[PDB]
Design a protein around this nucleic acid. Sequence first.
DNA 1: CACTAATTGAAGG
DNA 2: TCCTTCAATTAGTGAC
Length: 58
Amino acid sequence: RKPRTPFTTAQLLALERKFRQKQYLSIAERAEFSSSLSLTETQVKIWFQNRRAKAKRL
DNA sequence: CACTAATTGAAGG
DNA sequence: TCCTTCAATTAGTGAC
């Protein structure tokens, strides 16, 4: 498997507000956004995926 | 347990 | 036959 990534409180604030701006990223956006935070595209993809789930639960 | 990152796996492209 | 999405699942950390 793979260890949980400990996102920073700052990465997490960015991810949250990016998600507040739009809950989906296009590929280019994601490529850009992940580089901006120094996280892998997969990390961001999965964080958005998981957050969309949480947001559906609520 | 709550929360959340990661896995898996189907349906759609 | 790579990749997205969602649904469900698995599992790490951490409160109670």
